[PDB]
Design a binder for this molecule. Structure first.
Ligand code: ATP
Ligand code: ATP
Ligand code: MG
Ligand code: MG
Ligand code: ZN
Lengths: 295, 737, 121, 207
């Protein structure tokens, strides 16, 4: 709802299940799990976790910032408004099938219908590292390598405890092989454009688009399946912990995805996906910050 | 089913008197030639009396009789509304107005060459029809009409009658084979019965013979489909340090072929249908013709829910079947039935339902139970990152589905695959897939047996799938096989990934360019469905007959074939030059070949080849991408210029001399690669030094080489120069000691 | 004058524009200019085309001044070299060096003269 | 207290580098070993893992038999020391302008090189691509001060100091016994950003 937190990476590894892959953006759950792993080692987590259970604060996953904040592609929102030249309009539905990011300057034209040939953010490399003179020593690490002006901007509550944490994520880095040269960024808190904060709702019952991955509360998940158009994306992985000496596994939260269009926008959770018989909680942040489409 | 033995066989074995009247040249009306012929072969009058009156115009009132259904389903399965030519090419009406082509009518085999059409087959090859008709009479004799042998009869048509036309005295239906036309007519004729026996009618002469134009407007058919999602996430789950690399890659693309096969063959016996209704099956996509009633729609919705519970219990949203049906009347007929928005545009209506269901995947009660948790797992399956049922196959901890895929990769060489109940590698609800020998069918208990690349009848009464497969040697020997008998060859193995360009754009719209749109029917696209599957799933092993390669997968549009590099380069040159004769130059494809060293991992190997295919898709559309993204040549100047013209002339020089060795060739490559304006002068000096440095006997040979090499160096259009670089790469690779 | 995009096509034209032995029909259309008089000119420039790589321009300007000496001197001896420096505008181009990248452009211009001379007969 | 002090240095290549990576296509005449590069700028890079593993194997020969390497580089076991307190970044080749003023063609030289058989006496030519002499890369190294720490913080400083002297005595690259190394750290300063920790007395331990 409040000020967007522009973050310039220039090298980053973001997950997608494997190590050979690296997604462009990182979503709400990862950056929130970075803060809790940050506020723990400041000895400051209980001021954040008491804040982490309030209606006051929002959080949003990354989107490319190329001289202007961008947005997801609405999931199936453009309608089929032309039975002419099928030889090439199916090829048009090939390039406009891996696009997934739209600029805020023209996201209203996309709902109104416009092609929007996709621009390039961070061509993904895949460098084959090793370990010398060992048995089974060739892993392979992908890399998002950003295109000289593109940043990522979580959109969150302007909170002074939040800015103290995310000025230290500049030096611990987001994403994958941090402590190896990945994910280190430099934050730059800016302000929201006026026609973007116009539509950063959370509780506006209309044809509303999500801007983050959200697992709804069970009273809202019944009706949100009816008219929604969503992706599901399988948030999982190993739970990072200083208190195990054993790499356990999270309990596989299947969320929605950023860009899921919906009606009567629901309220989300902080899903304790801790493994069984485990000391602390694994928060796995999932509550939506929406985006009105026609309003 | 329970009575449809009378209806299905009679609507399939009708017009088989059009084979015998074609064979021996009788003057009798063709409605009776198969009628009397059935009596000395078998004895079943209820099937026979359909064939006695399937024409329904010589005697319309003789015997409530199911030949009424066979008449209307013959008109609708025909693209038109119904003198001795052969079967025309389907590509006579595809795309542009070109020359007329006609098939030579033959049977099919596992060793037969591809039977290409030509302009020289306007006459009537009558003698082969004797060889066709005796092939029918040898296997129709000892045969029973039941659901056990509901499926061996179809391959008896789809191999033998695969090139025989239908109603040759015509002007429009010149390319609809009798194997396909009998397959569509039996597909519709069951669906009228499931449309009428659900509504409650019993007489067939008032809603079929008099209300035919009403039935022409009556929506009575669904065009079902499905779409298996997450295929490449399942197939290309290989990584560097995968313990089974290429065997798992050849198994998973075969596993989902049987799964896409079993989604068809288990939906049809959940209904009352069979393999006539399946208009196509491919890489997950498959298209049906079902009945338009609530007794079948509720069966589809129930089976979609029941099958997704199977996929979810074994894959956890890696795979998802997505049905979709479009109700349509008799509008897929070329008799001006709202020609722009009627044929594809109701084939598209079922395609929009698939997109609506690929985007709203699950519902409430599943996703409440997906992330229920309560699982303190410690080790994961290190291939597919699953959790349940971990076994320890060769000291790695893999899951339950990936355990069977190593077992299915050992059972992959067999000819028969059966649907067990609880015997490993599951492909359906109470259905598991098992490789099996021939005489082991006596031992093992099954429900349906699938036979692979075969046309023999046998005793199994199996189902004939067609998976492209070849191995000339093991995969890890293809590097050391690239030598000659001399020892001259670079120890490399190449990987090609072919892809037909705009295949769905040529499948769906395809034929609308010729005429006003009077070739935009179902039977043309159903024949196009076979002819693109008959090429890539059967004929590709003939192209890889003795080549030192391994076709890992060939299906739909896509080929993926590892092998020794001299043959892989020769494979795709030989494939396309056949495939452009198969299609009269339309449906161009695109390829990408990549050399890789010995012992490199297949995931590094299969990925970079995919980088070259997607680079060759972006040349314009139609290109080969040799070895690297910057050798992206058109095929129309790679075979006729690089591989057969320029490489022949370079090889003609450097074998008729001992002087200009590899050092002369290597200094040409630097001169061909940099190419400023200054290297044109330095090349003109370099050739003219050696013109007089050579011995004076073969000075004309060098001078007819150098003035012909300098010719394609200074052309200044770049299309005659980069070819000369690629021709010299293919020559040094052939002479590498 | 010669830019980077034309100095080889200039030197291609200058060899064609140079005259030939129209008489003495024993392998005719041969030049009055000979190979060995031409390689004496490039032997001056080729030892500067490789000291342009190593050294500064600030030390080579003593021999670049000397190329105007000997391209004049070789032109004064034989009338065939006299025509070369007129057709190929060498004495014009030699007074226009001023930096490393034109010194290498002129010394590649002399190599283009030798290349097409060996090419055309 | 909580702090994240970093070690900004300018690295310097007294010989070449060769940090390889993905091998696409040899293409006859083309480079037989292309050095790793930044796929946007096409400038030679030094990845941080190539620094991070290199200065830990050197310290493994010094501080081995562990405990002081584990807290400075992490360990997959040992619940105390996952994500062990050193967060590196890749080098960025700062002087892409100072080299051009010195006069240079491209930032990556190509070294020709071969291999002579012991009996056949026949060569086997490489083309090992290098990154040229006296290029400087941006070197930064986040060491983290924490509540658990500042008991052994001084004793980690006598390791990372020693873990950069060893790169000045080893190669940091590929094919290092054949040259291609000899890297030097100059202007090695220890600034503190986001913290409160007096970095004065450390700065005389560095020089
Ligand atoms: N069984 C298979 N084996 C090998 N390749 C396949 C197979 N099935 C599909 N492909 C290839 O994968 C491509 C698309 O597969 P995908 O799984 O994305 O289908 P899809 O989910 O229907 O795609 P879309 O959602 O864009 O319609 C096709 O162009 C085809 O070449
Ligand atoms: N065996 C087949 N017969 C007909 N169509 C097919 C077959 N296999 C796949 N397709 C079609 O291919 C489409 C997916 O595009 P695909 O990349 O596979 O081929 P294409 O449409 O020719 O596009 P491209 O030129 O990119 O290959 C699907 O819409 C599907 O209908
Ligand atoms: Mg295709
Ligand atoms: Mg395709
Ligand atoms: Zn598995």
């Amino acid at each position: 709802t409040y000020k967007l937190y522009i973050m310039t990476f220039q090298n980053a590894h973001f997950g997608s299940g494997t190590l050979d892959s690296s997604k462009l953006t990182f979503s709400a759950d990862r950056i929130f799990s970075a803060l809790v792993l940050e506020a723990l080692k400041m000895g400051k987590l209980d001021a954040f976790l008491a804040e982490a259970n309030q209606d006051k604060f929002t959080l949003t996953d990354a989107f490319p910032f190329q001289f202007g904040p961008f947005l997801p592609k609405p999931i199936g929102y453009p309608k089929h408004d032309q039975s002419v030249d099928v030889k090439e309009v199916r090829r048009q539905a090939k390039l406009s099938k891996k696009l997934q990011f739209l600029a805020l300057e023209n996201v209203d034209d996309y709902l109104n219908g416009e092609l929007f040939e996709n621009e390039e953010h961070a061509v993904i490399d895949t460098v084959t590292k090793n370990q010398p003179h060992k048995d089974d020593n060739l892993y392979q690490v992908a890399t998002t390598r950003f295109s000289n002006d593109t940043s990522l901007y979580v959109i969150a509550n302007e909170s002074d405890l939040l800015n103290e944490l995310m000025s230290s994520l500049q030096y611990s880095g987001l994403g994958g092989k941090r402590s190896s040269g990945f994910g280190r960024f430099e934050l730059d808190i800016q302000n929201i454009p006026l026609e973007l904060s116009d539509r950063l709702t959370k509780n506006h019952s209309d044809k509303v688009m999500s801007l983050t991955t959200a697992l709804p509360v069970d009273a809202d998940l019944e009706e949100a399946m009816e008219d929604g158009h969503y992706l599901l994306t399988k948030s999982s992985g190993f739970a990072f912990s200083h208190a195990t000496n054993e790499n356990y596994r999270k309990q596989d939260l299947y969320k929605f995805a950023s860009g899921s269009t919906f009606s009567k926008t629901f309220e989300g959770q902080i899903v304790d996906v801790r493994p069984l018989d485990f000391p602390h909680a694994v928060l796995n942040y999932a509550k939506p910050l929406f985006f009105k489409l026609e309003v | 089913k329970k009575e449809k033995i009378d209806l299905f066989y009679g609507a399939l074995l009708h017009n088989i008197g059009k084979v015998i009247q074609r064979a021996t040249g009788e003057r009798k009306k063709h409605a009776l030639v198969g009628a009397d012929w059935f009596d000395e072969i078998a004895d079943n009058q209820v099937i026979s009396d359909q064939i006695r009156y399937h024409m329904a115009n010589y005697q319309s009132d003789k015997l409530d009789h199911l030949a009424y259904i066979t008449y209307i389903a013959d008109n609708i399965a025909s693209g038109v509304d119904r003198t001795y030519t052969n079967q025309a090419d389907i590509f006579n009406v595809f795309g542009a107005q070109t020359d007329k082509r006609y098939f030579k009518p033959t049977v099919l085999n596992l060793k037969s060459k591809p039977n290409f059409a030509s302009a020289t087959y306007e006459p009537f090859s009558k003698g082969d029809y004797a060889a066709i008709a005796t092939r029918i009479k040898n296997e129709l004799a000892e045969f029973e009409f039941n659901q056990v042998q509901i499926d061996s009869l179809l391959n008896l048509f789809e191999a033998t009658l695969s090139f025989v036309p239908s109603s040759t005295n015509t002007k429009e239906i010149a390319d609809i084979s009798l194997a396909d036309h009998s397959r569509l007519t039996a597909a519709f004729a069951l669906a009228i019965y499931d449309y009428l026996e659900d509504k409650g009618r019993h007489n067939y002469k008032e809603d079929l013979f008099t209300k035919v134009s009403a039935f022409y407007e009556e929506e009575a058919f669904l065009l079902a489909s499905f779409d298996l999602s997450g295929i490449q996430d399942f197939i290309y789950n290989i990584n560097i340090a995968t313990n089974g690399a290429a065997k798992q890659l050849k198994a998973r693309s075969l596993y989902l072929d049987f799964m896409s096969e079993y989604i068809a063959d288990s939906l049809l016996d959940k209904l009352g249908l069979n393999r006539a209704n399946m208009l196509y099956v491919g890489g997950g996509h498959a298209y049906f013709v079902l009945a338009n009633t609530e007794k079948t729609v509720e069966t589809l919705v129930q089976f979609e829910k029941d099958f997704n519970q199977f996929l979810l219990a074994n894959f956890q949203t890696r795979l998802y079947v997505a049905f979709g049906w479009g109700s349509f009347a008799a509008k897929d007929i070329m008799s001006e039935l709202n020609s722009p928005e009627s044929y594809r545009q109701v084939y598209q209506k079922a395609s929009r339902m698939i997109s609506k269901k690929k985007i709203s995947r699950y519902d409430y009660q599943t996703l409440m139970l997906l992330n229920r948790g309560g699982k303190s797992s410690e080790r994961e399956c290190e291939i597919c990152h699953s959790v349940e049922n971990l076994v320890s196959y060769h000291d790695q901890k893999v899951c339950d589905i990936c355990r069977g895929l190593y077992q299915f990769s050992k059972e992959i060489a067999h000819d028969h695959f059966i649907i067990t109940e609880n015997e490993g590698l599951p492909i359906g609800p109470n259905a598991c897939l098992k490789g099996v020998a021939f005489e082991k069918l006596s031992q093992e208990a099954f429900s349906r047996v699938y036979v692979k690349n075969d046309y023999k009848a046998g005793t199994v009464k199996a189902t004939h799938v067609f998976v492209g497969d070849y191995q000339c040697d093991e995969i890890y020997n293809y590097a050391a096989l690239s030598k000659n008998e001399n020892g001259l060859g670079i120890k490399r193995l190449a990987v090609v990934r072919l892809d037909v360009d705009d295949l769905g754009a040529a499948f769906m719209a395809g034929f609308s360019q010729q005429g006003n749109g009077q070739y935009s029917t179902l039977s043309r696209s159903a024949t196009f469905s076979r002819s693109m599957s008959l090429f890539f799933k059967v004929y590709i092993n003939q192209f890889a007959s003795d080549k030192k390669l391994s076709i890992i997968y060939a299906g739909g549009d896509d080929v993926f074939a590892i092998g020794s590099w001299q043959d892989i380069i020769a494979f795709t040159v030989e494939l396309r030059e056949n495939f452009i004769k198969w299609t009269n130059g339309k449906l161009t494809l695109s390829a990408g070949i990549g050399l890789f060293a010995d012992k490199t991992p297949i995931s590094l190997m299969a990925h970079q080849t995919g980088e070259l295919e997607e680079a060759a898709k972006g040349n314009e559309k139609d290109s080969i991408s040799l070895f690297s993204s910057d050798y992206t040549f058109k095929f129309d100047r790679f075979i006729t210029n690089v591989y057969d013209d320029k490489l022949e002339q370079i090889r003609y020089f450097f074998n008729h001399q001992d002087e200009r060795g590899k050092n002369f060739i290597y200094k040409l490559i630097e001169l061909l690669r940099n190419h400023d304006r200054m290297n044109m002068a330095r090349l003109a000096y370099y050739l003219t030094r050696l013109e007089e440095l050579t011995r004076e006997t073969d000075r004309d040979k060098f001078k007819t080489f150098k003035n012909l090499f300098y010719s394609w160096y200074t052309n200044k259009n770049d299309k005659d120069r980069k070819e000369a670089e690629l021709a010299l790469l293919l020559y040094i690779y052939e002479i590498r000691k | 004058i010669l830019t980077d995009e034309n100095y080889v096509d200039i030197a291609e034209k200058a060899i064609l524009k140079l005259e030939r032995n129209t008489r003495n029909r024993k392998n005719p259309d041969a030049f009055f200019l000979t190979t060995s008089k031409l390689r004496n000119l490039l032997s001056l420039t080729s030892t500067l085309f490789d000291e342009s790589k190593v050294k500064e321009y600030d030390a080579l300007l003593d021999r670049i001044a000397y190329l105007r000496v000997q391209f004049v001197y070789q032109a004064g001896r034989e009338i065939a070299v006299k025509d070369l420096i007129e057709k190929a505008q060498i004495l014009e181009a030699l007074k226009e060096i001023k930096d490393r990248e034109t010194l290498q452009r002129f010394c590649r211009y002399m190599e283009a003269l030798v290349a097409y001379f060996k090419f055309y007969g | 207290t909580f702090a994240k002090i970093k070690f900004s240095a300018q690295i310097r290549l007294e010989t070449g580098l060769h940090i390889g990576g993905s091998d696409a296509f040899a293409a006859i005449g083309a480079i037989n070993s292309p050095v790793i590069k930044d796929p946007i700028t096409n400038l030679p890079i030094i990845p941080g893992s190539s620094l991070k593993g290199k200065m830990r194997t050197l310290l493994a020969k010094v501080y081995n038999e562990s405990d002081i390497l584990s807290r400075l580089f992490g360990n997959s076991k040992d619940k105390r020391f996952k994500m062990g307190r050193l967060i590196f970044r890749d080098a960025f080749l700062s002087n892409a302008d100072e080299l051009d003023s010195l006069g240079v063609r491209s930032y990556t030289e190509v070294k020709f090189e071969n291999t002579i058989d012991r009996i056949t006496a026949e060569a086997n030519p490489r083309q090992i691509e290098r990154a040229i002499r006296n290029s400087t890369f941006d070197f930064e190294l986040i060491y983290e001060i924490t509540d658990e720490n500042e008991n052994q913080v001084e004793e980690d400083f006598k390791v990372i100091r020693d873990g950069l002297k060893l790169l000045e005595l080893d190669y940091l690259g590929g094919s290092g016994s054949r040259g291609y190394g000899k890297v030097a750290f100059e202007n090695l300063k220890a600034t503190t950003v986001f913290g409160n920790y007096d970095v004065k007395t450390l700065n005389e331990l560095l020089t």
